[PDB]
Amino acid sequence: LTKEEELLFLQLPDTLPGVGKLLIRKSGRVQLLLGKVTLDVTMGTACSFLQELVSVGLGDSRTGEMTVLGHVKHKLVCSPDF
Amino acid sequence: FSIGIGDVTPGQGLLKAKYELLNAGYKKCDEYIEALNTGKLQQQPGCTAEETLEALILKELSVIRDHAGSACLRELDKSNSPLTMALCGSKGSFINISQMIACVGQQAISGSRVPDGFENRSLPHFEKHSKLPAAKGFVANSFYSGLTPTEFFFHTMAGREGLVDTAVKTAETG
Amino acid sequence: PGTQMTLKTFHFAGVASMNITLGVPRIKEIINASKAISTPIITAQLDKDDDADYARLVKGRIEVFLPDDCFILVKLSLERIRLLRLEVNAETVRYSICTSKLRVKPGDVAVHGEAVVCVTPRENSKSSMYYVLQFLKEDLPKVVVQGIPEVSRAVIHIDEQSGKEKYKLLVEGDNLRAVMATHGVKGTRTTSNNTYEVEKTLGIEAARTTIINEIQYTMVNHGMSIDRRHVMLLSDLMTYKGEVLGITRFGLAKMKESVLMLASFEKTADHLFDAAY
Amino acid sequence: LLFCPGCGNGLIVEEGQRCHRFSCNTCPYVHNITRKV
Amino acid sequence: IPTVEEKWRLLPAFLKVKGLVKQHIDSFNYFINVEIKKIMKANEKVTSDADPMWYLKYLNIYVGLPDVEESFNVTRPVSPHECRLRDMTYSAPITVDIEYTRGSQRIIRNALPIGRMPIMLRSSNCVLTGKTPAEFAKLNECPLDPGGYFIVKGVEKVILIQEQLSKNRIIVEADRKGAVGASVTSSTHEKKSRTNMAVKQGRFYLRHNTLSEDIPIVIIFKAMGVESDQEIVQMIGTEEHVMAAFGPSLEECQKAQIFTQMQALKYIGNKVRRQRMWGGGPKKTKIEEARELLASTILTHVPVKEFNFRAKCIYTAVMVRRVILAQGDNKVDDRDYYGNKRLELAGQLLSLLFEDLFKKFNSEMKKIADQVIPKQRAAQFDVVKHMRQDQITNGMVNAISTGNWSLKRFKMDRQGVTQVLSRLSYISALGMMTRISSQFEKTRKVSGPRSLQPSQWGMLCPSDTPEGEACGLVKNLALMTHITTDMEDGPIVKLASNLGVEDVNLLCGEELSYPNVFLVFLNGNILGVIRDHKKLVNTFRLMRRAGYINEFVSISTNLTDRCVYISSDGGRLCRPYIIVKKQKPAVTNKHMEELAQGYRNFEDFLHESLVEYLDVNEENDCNIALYEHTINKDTTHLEIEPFTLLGVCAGLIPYPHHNQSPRNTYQCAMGKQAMGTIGYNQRNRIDTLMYLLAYPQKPMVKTKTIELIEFEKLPAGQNATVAVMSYSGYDIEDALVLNKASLDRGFGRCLVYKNAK
Amino acid sequence: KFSSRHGQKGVCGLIVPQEDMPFCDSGICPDIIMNPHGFPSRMTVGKLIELLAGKAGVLDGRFHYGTAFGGSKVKDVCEDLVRHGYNYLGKDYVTSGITGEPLEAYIYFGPVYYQKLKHMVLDKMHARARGPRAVLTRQPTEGRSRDGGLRLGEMERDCLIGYGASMLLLERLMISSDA
Amino acid sequence: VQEIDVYLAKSLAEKLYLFQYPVRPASMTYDDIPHLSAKIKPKQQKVELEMAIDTLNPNYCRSKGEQIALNMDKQTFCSSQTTSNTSRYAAALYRQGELHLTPLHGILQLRPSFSYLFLQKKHAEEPWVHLHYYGL
Amino acid sequence: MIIPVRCFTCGKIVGNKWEAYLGLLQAEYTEGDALDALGLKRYCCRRMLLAHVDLIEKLLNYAP
């Protein structure tokens, strides 16, 4: 993939509770060696930018202030491959 | 009269004239089929030319069957059955002393070789997008050395003409 | 003879294109003379006794760019494509687009467009601001490139038959008199394959002979040669009143024929009860 | 051809009589235009 | 031992649990087993509208088996004799316990017969399963009868298997005139027909089930509001041709008007024809645009089952893009392709009738309840008044006998299904069974679907045709071709959420992107986004191939269109195949000494990626090879054996190589009726045309498939010395100078019986 | 009715007695007889072989297989016929009962497996004495339910009227059902 | 082999709501967010704003809104809500040195509403809104 | 059902020779040689024993 300072958006397959690490391998096979050693060896996703998102964190302006922060980058997914 | 088997066995001294012509035929058909991706010969003429490497391969397999037939009807010793049921219009013809000796090919569907019906290939027991005298029906085994299960299922699909021909014949005539 | 043989006659025909079209079920079309016939094929000769080029000139005689915005309509591939397809002109395109400027919807005549060497068809000012729609479609298609103004594709037969080189026009569009201006021609040998059209376009016994030969094409396929006097008798049945109303399977407006055939609508139904009441 | 990017609606006229400019229906905005096929 | 014997001794391995007839018995076993409980889930729960809520509730409806097992022949147990002589019928009552929500509170749970199940002879409830050819004496019957046929007033009624096309699936044909996107969906209920059309020179409309006219699509997309018509066009496509071609429809809609949902949809609010049911909308006076939109939850009428209409939106927007086949003149999708035709089978018709008879009885119970309000007594719902019991009997028997599955909820009054087993031998006793019957084929004399398509090499026989009218229209499902009933879609939903299949509510009309292969059709059900087909599919295969999800879940990867299906629904044909492992068949030349003698118990060649089950589609992906002897190293599966396209009634010729196809069609018709030994019953039974022989002889040039039928213990013809000789003008056009002194010495007796009743 | 296992459905033309049928040299005379005119135009060569693996499987005790796309070829069967004393081709050397001297051209033999179909000429005994036109339903004896015999339906009377003789047609009219 | 580590950042992501725009791809256009007049709901956002239209072009045919009402001109939005990958772990800001996971709330798409004529309990009442900038 | 007493095309008597093979298939010759120790030196009777199906036993299993 790419090694930059984007503000990405992951997907992770749902693991009920039975620090992450993008320990990228060679040849681009990017992996995720995570505690409870399961290897969510995953990324490379269908693109975007027909949608120009905004990653607002709702500050709850009824009590706070909302903020436009992280508009959009190349979203990511995970799929624990076998 | 007694048609035994030797009435429908070609000699083992002129089986050659089928194997070598199979080699030559498949060779030239492969040459052209390779060509239609590069086109050094070339089609266009024909007009069209996409499946006008159909007419040429059709008539190459026709040359194959004509050669084979004429090999089915030369060494037949004259003291023979079906030879003596086509020398006399009695029962059957010279294109049935050939489907029983050398080359029952080629079947068709509608005056055209077997279409697809899996995507870009006729049968799945083959390779994608690759027309040839095998992936689009062309039996090459005489009913003596009968056939293979990719030459039977291209036989009950031109066979199912004489069962649909003689079954919608009585649709308009009735 | 429509019932017996269909096997070794319509399938060799193995395997080639170029003029082997129909067999026995053409009997249905000849008898019925139905207008839903999908083969209105109209044969006709040409400057026949010639070479491929000699007749090819008349063959060519027989018979596409960016539409824009900001007060401009379109252009044309008026380049050597037409000059190597068929003799037409940018002025011919102007003349055609002048004709109703559309088919079946009220476009304009606009008198006129194409004020350049290549057509500038002058999308008429947006009086009907509704649509650039017709402004695009009505010019997009062919207007001077159909060769009969109502026809499917023309055909050419550069074929060496009867020893010499024959050259025909297997046109597929009704009706005859399409061969008025085929300055070939060969007008003596102009023919047809649709009974009701040749009824009005050509002579009466012309249509009788066409019905004779039409059923004598469904039987040349292998073996079967029924007696010519039989099809002669059928053709005589076709043309009692001269004006050719061939014996159809549902009825005829020919009072000297048998009125029994009229009732055979395949078959009797409630209509006879309604007529009885 | 083109979409009036204000409210995501359609474009209407040529207007080349004056210039390239528009009054997109129901999207009360103006853009210019150009270059169909 | 050799390379070969392995692949030709997989037959008695799979021909025991799921073989040649046993699809019939499997389907109906499941339909006795669980699907009846499924239909029980359509409980009553509505019956007490004008009442203190005296609802019924079926506790557990089983076919004589709630808490019971020996209720499977409830006429004081009875064999098929005592049903083929006394003319009685099999019967097991579909008993149930009920849960009166009674206001007098007596919740009565007596086991109540609701009718009778005509049990398929030799199902997993009959008294003829798990028994030896010695136990087959007290039950008067052969061991080797086909089994799977019903008992209809002493008449053996089989159920021909139909070929009804797939539901839930677009059918993008291409008429000679224009394209037709006709998604003939269903919901197990009705033939809903929400077809699109390329109607008038680039003008798109919906001949919905009801709607009064043709509705311009852009207004339809308004009806599931995507009102930013920019979104409509970008979703339909992003290239030049797609946008331009679709343009006219948006232009016409806007020229009419552009409104949101609360307007420009009264344009369809009143233009609706299911408004024709003004009397069918008695309550809810709320009826107009907003209210056929409230009832537009059923304006699903399609596989996709959401309440926020984005699912139906994308369905219409892939419809609209797979009707404009990018100048849909070169692209053609043909009907007769056995990935499309899904076999509805004896059990499936019985399941329709389960559904409809229980619902009809419940409806009449509801009517009685809704009239019994004046009755101040306890028997508003009581068993005593609940007395249509043993009258589902008559419905079932009438259906199986007259051949009429007369219906109202499913829009089909089908007649012509059930027939009588042609017991002229046990050869035609099978050939009658294992027969598939065609369907509409709009003009059946238009012989398009009459020639045998190459699209079921295997799964349907090549030469079984009754010349005449039923050629290519009655079909012998003639061999190894296993069959699927239904699955659970859940454990593919999980693998979709995991394996890299996005949620479509995270993206917009990017869906013209060639890296983004985005057919994910979980049985028509909606779609799945994510790219990387050539990993999702391959890891999904290589996950089911190792003991996980049940080996039937075929997935096609076509590249002309972005096709990646997940077809896990019924009607699918199948076949077993040897896994090549992409280099060498995974049977290793030494499974024989496990394939034959001891262990690898069996079907455990399916839990080890050794041999696996295809479909038509997955065959359209894979690359099979006839023999090992000519594998070329790109093959995905391997043929178990060539001789199982020629099937049970058709693999009777010796050396079917050398004959023509017409000759084997003739024989595979004749061989059926030919006088033969009906088997072992014969004398104990009574039946009309028992055309026995008296001195029959085994074949003597036999086929490895003559043995497997078991019907070489029961040969159908004398074995005759024969010359090839022309005697004297009587032989001539296929005539036989049969000498006497062999008719005298018994060559070819007959024992024509008949029957007076 | 006979069948053959090869869609070769002959019928008993003659029924000859034992003494007239040809006998090879051993003593074998046919049960059935075909004539070699069903083969060369039907091309069932799956029958010239079945008679090889019959006569080679019994003369040796074997019990042979010709299975779809497998089987047992012609060479081994030929050698079996050799081992028990016959041709490669299994064509016997017959003399003719009628006159008592060798047939000039040899005569194929060996076991076939003739099936014996339904639809005989005894279940198909049918005839009609008279047909009047009744008063109950006012019908002649059409098809069944009155007798067996004929039914001159559409194409049948279409042929009847298409003869070309005047009072042949008149007679057909006058004798049709009633006059 | 960049082995960058992913913080399971507990920095409150309950606030995080992805907003999507299947509206503005034409020229990398954005809202130039303020333009506030801001109104937002927590459930089915229905973001209603001050997307006031530019003025350089000739008057933008203001008679349109003057036909009924435009009071500059709000181009408001109703949020097409979704249930989606937000609960997978729906990531956030990622440097090449650090990586902060934060699990978002339900993503919501946004689209203009075309206002051409049980959230009302409190969710529809909630729009007291302030879209503002703070490096955080 | 039972054994033809005569070889339909030979004449030889046969029915005397079925309770010897069921005693000569357990001395365990090859069928082709249980049918040479009893006389059958032609096509005919080899058919008439090799090809026949003794449904007698299995039918009589439940006769009454």
UniProtKB/Swiss-Prot annotation, chain A:
It is found in: Nucleus. Component of the RNA polymerase III complex consisting of 17 subunits: a ten-subunit horseshoe-shaped catalytic core composed of POLR3A/RPC1, POLR3B/RPC2, POLR1C/RPAC1, POLR1D/RPAC2, POLR3K/RPC10, POLR2E/RPABC1, POLR2F/RPABC2, POLR2H/RPABC3, POLR2K/RPABC4 and POLR2L/RPABC5; a mobile stalk composed of two subunits POLR3H/RPC8 and CRCP/RPC9, protruding from the core and functioning primarily in transcription initiation; and additional subunits homologous to general transcription factors of the RNA polymerase II machinery, POLR3C/RPC3-POLR3F/RPC6-POLR3G/RPC7 heterotrimer required for transcription initiation and POLR3D/RPC4-POLR3E/RPC5 heterodimer involved in both transcription initiation and termination. It comes from Homo sapiens. This is DNA-directed RNA polymerase III subunit RPC4. Belongs to the eukaryotic RPC4/POLR3D RNA polymerase subunit family. The chain holds residues 260 to 389 of 398 of the full protein.
UniProtKB/Swiss-Prot annotation, chain C:
Changing R26Q: In WDRTS; uncertain significance. Expressed in the brain, in the cortex and the white matter (at protein level). Residues 1-27 are annotated as: Trigger loop. DNA nontemplate strand binds at R103. It is found in: Nucleus; Cytoplasm, Cytosol. DNA template strand binds at R249, K267. Changing K75R: In WDRTS; uncertain significance. Belongs to the RNA polymerase beta' chain family. Component of the RNA polymerase III (Pol III) (Pol III) complex consisting of 17 subunits: a ten-subunit catalytic core composed of POLR3A/RPC1, POLR3B/RPC2, POLR1C/RPAC1, POLR1D/RPAC2, POLR3K/RPC10, POLR2E/RPABC1, POLR2F/RPABC2, POLR2H/RPABC3, POLR2K/RPABC4 and POLR2L/RPABC5; a mobile stalk composed of two subunits POLR3H/RPC8 and CRCP/RPC9, protruding from the core and functioning primarily in transcription initiation; and additional subunits homologous to general transcription factors of the RNA polymerase II machinery, POLR3C/RPC3-POLR3F/RPC6-POLR3G/RPC7 heterotrimer required for transcription initiation and POLR3D/RPC4-POLR3E/RPC5 heterodimer involved in both transcription initiation and termination. This is DNA-directed RNA polymerase III subunit RPC1. It comes from Homo sapiens. The gene is POLR3A.
Swiss-Prot record, chain D:
A zinc finger (C4-type) spans 4-27. Zn(2+) 1 binds at C4, C7, C24, C27. Keywords: Antiviral defense, Disease variant, DNA-directed RNA polymerase, Immunity, Innate immunity, Leukodystrophy, Metal-binding, Neurodegeneration, Nucleus, Transcription, Zinc, Zinc-finger. One of its GO terms (biological process) is transcription by RNA polymerase III. GO terms for molecular function: DNA-directed RNA polymerase activity; nucleic acid binding; zinc ion binding. GO terms for cellular component: cytosol; nucleoplasm; RNA polymerase III complex. It comes from the Eukaryota. It is found in: Nucleus. Core component of RNA polymerase III (Pol III) which synthesizes small non-coding RNAs using the four ribonucleoside triphosphates as substrates. Can mediate Pol I proofreading of the nascent RNA transcript. Anchors into the Pol III active site to constantly monitor transcription fidelity, cleaves mis-incorporated 5'-ribonucleotides and restarts the transcription process. Once Pol III reaches the poly(dT) termination signal, can induce Pol III clamp opening and transcription termination. Belongs to the archaeal RpoM/eukaryotic RPA12/RPB9/RPC11 RNA polymerase family. This is DNA-directed RNA polymerase III subunit RPC10. It comes from Homo sapiens. The lineage of its organism: Eukaryota, Metazoa, Chordata, Craniata, Vertebrata.
From Swiss-Prot, chain F:
It is found in: Nucleus; Cytoplasm, Cytosol. RNA binds at K1, K9, K124. DNA template strand binds at R144, S145, R151. Catalytic core component of RNA polymerase III (Pol III), a DNA-dependent RNA polymerase which synthesizes small non-coding RNAs using the four ribonucleoside triphosphates as substrates. Synthesizes 5S rRNA, snRNAs, tRNAs and miRNAs from at least 500 distinct genomic loci. Pol III-mediated transcription cycle proceeds through transcription initiation, transcription elongation and transcription termination stages. During transcription initiation, Pol III is recruited to DNA promoters type I, II or III with the help of general transcription factors and other specific initiation factors. Belongs to the RNA polymerase beta chain family. This is DNA-directed RNA polymerase III subunit RPC2. It comes from Homo sapiens. The gene is POLR3B. The chain holds residues 896 to 1074 of 1133 of the full protein.
